[PDB]
Each structure stands twice: as structure tokens, then as C-alpha cells.
Design a protein around this ligand. Structure first.
Ligand SMILES: [K+]
Ligand SMILES: [Mg+2]
Ligand SMILES: [Mg+2]
Ligand SMILES: [Mg+2]
Ligand SMILES: [Mg+2]
Ligand SMILES: [Mg+2]
Ligand SMILES: [Mg+2]
Ligand SMILES: [Mg+2]
Ligand SMILES: [Mg+2]
Lengths: 136, 296, 136, 49, 49
């Protein structure tokens, strides 16, 4: 995510609070604020839609095979949303490098909770509370 | 050809990165000059307020001197903790050409000062007892005049005006007022030396020029909002406050020392250095009838 | 859980990362890396199958009545599995002193995410992210 | 995220350039040892055989 | 052949010890940033079976 201030674009600080900062290898090229899941042994890739694929958000831009840092659960984070989010909305990955509400997805439970509401394409402030994986 | 810098621009030297980082938008710091500053010992407290002055009594010779003693009341302060932090990796702290820790100390300091200024401006605008409604007419100087009129009419001496950018466009539209201290008195004393001696207006010896963004409209993250609109564009907007700077109190509490406390931490598990800042701040009128807002 | 280096077997260090280390009392004799749940007031026993019985994993061997250190959610752990786990598998207690997948179990949500895959009877590396008590 | 290298690699610092330039291929220099050397008085001259 | 060692807080391997007084654990951890790079790969030959 990025912030326009006149002629300038600035990077958005993904991490608001928390110390759930954990090392993985990028399975593809990943960007700051992007949701990710485990694609291999300690290897993380961009999440797809409708849940079952979330470990954390990518902290900084990385190329494939580079060591990545993630914010996991009990981090407060700045993240980009594909729709309008109000406070107390549960959110999970949209599959587009962004987040959507549980209410919009086919999933029944989220991974983060919106603390500060945002419009579509803008930065919400959210708290990461869960991870989602393969349940069959 | 030969050897020139366009060829070897990353090969034989690096492009300079300047050791000075140029500032973002800086919001106008006024509150410490534009109000009385109380270094409180406690986060909650109250300031004693005296009853208005009266007149001594025509008295016969050998007659009893009668009592009209000072009666007292109080206004409460409840200082809110304003905090900002920043984190930097050890690798980032070491590699920076800029002193990154010093900069984060500046950012934290600046952000806290903006907080103080927000608290001050929100209190000042919301709790002023007087008001000059311009009703979309005679805006600028006749409005400032009338607002001084309202404070003075209630027997308070105004000495300061706080102004919005849009009000500073309506005021100073007159070429008579072109020599006035439009920059803010604090701006000229901070960021100049040779002040133009003539510049005071309407007997107010401070212009506290303030920023559009400073008032608490509740749109900012973690801030709940004040009662008014700070602006000068629509009916109801408060564009200026005329007041006595000794009758509004900025109350600053710190558990250690008297002013902003900066703390640092090293995280050896993650190799992150943090800088945190804190101050506790309230703002209160001792007399709100010492102030008038200008309404669009 | 145990590790082989030549003829030697070594005790596996249960904790990879995390600080969610908490004191309970053993309701029975417990072994290192064993999943546990609350059996009484501040008292933990080994988990049964099919969910509703997970607080954390036991960090060292205890006899009945002794003080247990438990690794909760927010811990990366080396844990033994009863079946093949891939990375991104959700796992929960098996009832046999081990972890099994949510897919295998009669349950539908897990307590840890597999970060490094392992065969049946081997040591996976997992991140504990949830607690399961009784819901009736 | 916090300030970190991959974010600010070319905005808060410059990647190091080493102060020492590393040498290319050195050819072997032997002609002076390997032959009779004449420090001639003239650019042109003759040797009697 | 150049072994390139980057250390944020010094020259070389940094060993940090930490005490957790909430849990009574001592941590020992170590860090280094390392690359390796030839200035001249022609200055080396591999022997192949
Ligand atoms: K958690
Ligand atoms: Mg952690
Ligand atoms: Mg008497
Ligand atoms: Mg009286
Ligand atoms: Mg009180
Ligand atoms: Mg009045
Ligand atoms: Mg009106
Ligand atoms: Mg004139
Ligand atoms: Mg000749």
C-alpha cells in the first residue's frame, strides 16, 4: 500500500503494534501489506479468496526465494481493502493482494478485525487474531 | 568516452544521498506561547478560580468596614496521554546516512506538539462563551473588530487571536492590513529575527496563526471529535478565536521530568530498536467569557 | 518426540519461538510435547480426540500433581504427528499423545498450523494459534 | 513496516561502493630478464654480425 | 574471492544475551549478515569428476 502527499508517494507502515514478527521464504514475489499462507515448508505465497489460506501480512517487498518477515496474530496492521469496511468487521484475504469482509466472502470466519474503517482501495487499521489453514 | 560520470555513475562512486532529510508538511506550533502552560504534578487536578473583582464601598468615618471577600470555585483538568512510537531495524539504524534515531525523536516530538496544539485548539474553539455570527457578510476585519467587541463588552481584555487559513484569506483582503503580522507572532520569533515593529492588529499582540488540520474533527485515528467545525467556508464554521492567552491553560503532566518523555528499547529477539514518546495534556479555560469565536 | 544423530537419540526442544509459557498443575503423568487441556482448576491432563480439549503443549516431563510449563498459542513448536502432514495443514490433538490433521479428525477447526511437513511418527514444526475448551 | 533496509535501500542510505578497485588480468613481464637489453643512445642503430 | 561480513553493531558476529525476569529464561542469540563474491571468477578453477 502507498500514500500520496502532493507529488510524493510514501510507503505505508504495515505494522501498527505487536511483536509476532516471523521469518519465512517467499514462494513468489510479495509486496508490503500483502496477505500470505504456507505454500511449502516455511515457504509463503499470496493468499487466495474464501479462507483456509492465511498466516500473516508481508512486512516489506521481496523477490521469489528471498527471506521475508511477516506480521502474524496479535499484530495491529495497516492493510488495503477491496470494499467498504466499518469498525468491528471481520476480514480475510480477497485473493487480490487485499482484504474483504467475511460477509462478502464464502468463508464463515475471519483472520483480522477492523479497528478503523476504510473505503474500497484505502488503508484500514485491523487487528490480526487468527491463522487459517487446510481443514479439508 | 574517456571517463565521465554518466558512464560510471554507480561504478566508481555513488550518487549523493543528502544527510539532511527535508520536512513533510509541518503544522503550526503555537500552544506554548498562545496559552498559559501549567506543569502539573498530577494527571487529574483542579485550578482555583477567583470571583470577579468588585468595587470598594463608600464608607462613613468610624463606620464598620464590611466584607465582600473573594469567593472561589474550580475548573477540573483530566490530562489525556498522547503517545507516538516508531520502530527501526538494527540494520536500518546502522545503515542510514541520516541519524534515524534523532529523526524519530524529532518526529515523535513534533507529533506530540501537534497533539498539544490539537487539544488546545479544540478546547479554545468548543468552549468559548462568546460568538460573532457574520451571517455570510462583513467578514475579515469587521468580524475581528466585532469579536474583540464581544470579549471587551463582557469586560475582558483580549490580547490574542487564533486564526484558520480561510479566515486569514478574508482578513488581510484589505490592502490597509497588508503590513500586519499575518505569519503568526510565534512564526516570526521562531523563524526570523528582524520583526516589522508595526505588525500588531486590533490591540492583539499575538497572532497565533494555526493550521486547518489541527482541530479535532474526529476524522483522525484515535481522536473522537469536538462540537464545532474549524473552517471559514460554510454557515456555522468557526474561523477565528479572539481571547486572553492568560485565561486559557494548557496543562502538561509527565511522570518523569516536566515535559515530553522519550524512551528507547532494544529488542534482541527481533533486532528492532523502538523510540516512544509520551506526554499527558489537557486544556481548560479559566474564563471562557474571555474569548469570542468568529462564525461564518 | 526425539531426534537421531548417528547412534544417539536426543530429546527434541519443544519450543522453537514464543513467550506464551504458562504454569499449570499436572492432573496425570505427562511427557514433553504432549497436547493438554484443563481437567480441573489450574490443572491440565492429556487431550482426548476430536476437539474441545486443548490449552497448549507440555514443555518437559512431569509426574502427577507436579507444576507443568505449557506452551500456548503464539508458540512455534516441534510436535509429533500420527499421520503425514503437509505445510498449511491444520492439526489438533489425536488422543494418543500426538497431533493429527483436522481432515482426519471428526473436528472441523485446528489448534496449530504445520510450518514444516513430516511423515507418520515424525516431528513436524507447528505454530499454535488457538485454544479449544468445552462448548457443550 | 518499521524502518528497514529493503524499503529504504536507496532513500535513507546508499549501497556501499568499495574503496578499493579490484585489479584485472596481469600479464607476465619478463622481456628485460629474458633478453640482452640495449639502452640505446639513438632510436635507430645497427648491431655488427 | 571476497567474504563480505555486515554487522549492524560492530565488525563481526554479535552475540546478544537477554534475561526474561517474567519467565526466568536466559536467551543467547547470534547474528551476522554474510555474502561471498568473486572479484575475478577467472582466478579460480573447479575440479570435476
Ligand atoms: K493469539
Ligand atoms: Mg512471536
Ligand atoms: Mg457591627
Ligand atoms: Mg459581591
Ligand atoms: Mg477535581
Ligand atoms: Mg457575551
Ligand atoms: Mg448562520
Ligand atoms: Mg490607508
Ligand atoms: Mg642503419
Amino acid at each position: 500500500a502507498t500514500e500520496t502527499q502532493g507529488e510524493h508517494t510514501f510507503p505505508v507502515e504495515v505494522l501498527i503494534s505487536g511483536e509476532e514478527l516471523r521469518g519465512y521464504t517467499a514462494g513468489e514475489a510479495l509486496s508490503a501489506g500483502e496477505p500470505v499462507y504456507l505454500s511449502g515448508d516455511y515457504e509463503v505465497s499470496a493468499s487466495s479468496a474464501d479462507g483456509g489460506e492465511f498466516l500473516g501480512v508481508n512486512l516489506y517487498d521481496v523477490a521469489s526465494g528471498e527471506p521475508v518477515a511477516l506480521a502474524g496474530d496479535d499484530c495491529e496492521v495497516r492493510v488495503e481493502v477491496s470494499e467498504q469496511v466499518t469498525a468491528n468487521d471481520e476480514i480475510l484475504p480477497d485473493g487480490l493482494g487485499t482484504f474483504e469482509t467475511v460477509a462478502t466472502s464464502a468463508a464463515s470466519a475471519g483472520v483480522a478485525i477492523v479497528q478503523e474503517g476504510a473505503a474500497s482501495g484505502e488503508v484500514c487499521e485491523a487487528y490480526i487474531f487468527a491463522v487459517q489453514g487446510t481443514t479439508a | 568516452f574517456a571517463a565521465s560520470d554518466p558512464e560510471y555513475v554507480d561504478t566508481l562512486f555513488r550518487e549523493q544521498l543528502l544527510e539532511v532529510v527535508m520536512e513533510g508538511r509541518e503544522l503550526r506550533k503555537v500552544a506554548r506561547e498562545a496559552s498559559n502552560v501549567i506543569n502539573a504534578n498530577t494527571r487529574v487536578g483542579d485550578v482555583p478560580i477567583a470571583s470577579d473583582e468588585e468595587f470598594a464601598r463608600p464608607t462613613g468615618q468610624g463606620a464598620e468596614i464590611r466584607d465582600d471577600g473573594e469567593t472561589y470555585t474550580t475548573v477540573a483538568w483530566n490530562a489525556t496521554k498522547l503517545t507516538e512510537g516508531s520502530r527501526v531495524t538494527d540494520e536500518m539504524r546502522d545503515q542510514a546516512m541520516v541519524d534515524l534515531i534523532e529523526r524519530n525523536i524529532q518526529r515523535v516530538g513534533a507529533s506530540l506538539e501537534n497533539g498539544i496544539n490539537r487539544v488546545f485548539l479544540t478546547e479554545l474553539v468548543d468552549n468559548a462563551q462568546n460568538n460573532h455570527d457574520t451571517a455570510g457578510s462583513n467578514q475579515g476585519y469587521q468580524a475581528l473588530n466585532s469579536a474583540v467587541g464581544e470579549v471587551d463588552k463582557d469586560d475582558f481584555r483580549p490580547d490574542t487571536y487564533v486564526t484558520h487559513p480561510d479566515y486569514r484569506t478574508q482578513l488581510f483582503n484589505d490592502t490597509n492590513l497588508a503590513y500586519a503580522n499575518r505569519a503568526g507572532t510565534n512564526e516570526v520569533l521562531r523563524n526570523r529575527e528582524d520583526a516589522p515593529i508595526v505588525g500588531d492588529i486590533a490591540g492583539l499582540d499575538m497572532h497565533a496563526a494555526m493550521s486547518s488540520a489541527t482541530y479535532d474533527d474526529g476524522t483522525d485515528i484515535g481522536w473522537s471529535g469536538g462540537s464545532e467545525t474549524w473552517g471559514f467556508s460554510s454557515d456555522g464554521d468557526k474561523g477565528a478565536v479572539v481571547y486572553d492567552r492568560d485565561n486559557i491553560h494548557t496543562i502538561l503532566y509527565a511522570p518523569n521530568g516536566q515535559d515530553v518523555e522519550i524512551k528507547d528499547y532494544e529488542d534482541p529477539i527481533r533486532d528492532i530498536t523502538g523510540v516512544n514518546g509520551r506526554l499527558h495534556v489537557d486544556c481548560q479555560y479559566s474564563q471562557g467569557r474571555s474569548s469570542a469565536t468568529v462564525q461564518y
